[PDB]
Amino acid sequence: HHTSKIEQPRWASKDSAAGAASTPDEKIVLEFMDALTSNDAAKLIEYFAEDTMYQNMPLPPAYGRDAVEQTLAGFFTVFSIDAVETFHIGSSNGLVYTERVDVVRALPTGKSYNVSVLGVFQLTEGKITGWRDYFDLREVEEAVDLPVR
């Protein structure tokens, strides 16, 4: 499957280091973003602590590493993440923030959508203890023609 390059939004920072990971935890998160296109829950779960959580905010949260892995595996049964571009990354107080576009493709329909997402990650000892992505679900559902909620 061919995926077109994600363009830079008008508002992308004039500060050229805004997309740069400047700490070990930010570097882990950018590596994790790169890994999302694997569509591989077993590969992804290695980034997570045992005590952890994951939530796409328009949907219910998963608590615990097993539940997070099951949620990811379920997601990749239906969707492919074809590309991720992180425009901005920053961090304070044990939390890392990423402003991104993720290209998501619904396997049942063949249709794709570039999702605007702002995400937050909590890390302890270099492992993810929380990951929440915020975006509008209805826009995704309408674009890929697949109800998710």
Add this chain to the structure above:
Amino acid sequence: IEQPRWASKDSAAGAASTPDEKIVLEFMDALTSNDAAKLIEYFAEDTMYQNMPLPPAYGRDAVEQTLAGFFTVFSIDAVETFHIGSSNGLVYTERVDVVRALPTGKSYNVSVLGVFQLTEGKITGWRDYFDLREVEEAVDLPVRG
């Protein structure tokens, strides 16, 4: 507003540690004024605003118009910021905003993650990410055009 299960137990996570973070928290406090003319004072001439499920506003005049339009329909009754952080001139806020739809009188606690760009202490960009359908269904108002 209840504390989310996932919110940091360290109150440093929600406290400003830099001048830009301090400005953003002051701005969050100001939102309950519901006053676009007051709020626009925080914005640079070169700026933008977008509630991500809706069209963006570019330039200070358009931002003020968009804010004014918003406050004719909604009141912001409270803002609680659980987490605030920053790097490279951008501030991030994980919040709940209590919004009330004026036509129906119904309120909803919106989970929002927002980003602010600042230059010389003024807002050059503000984008809030959240699910719009949840808000519309809770307050009985079909916001999106």
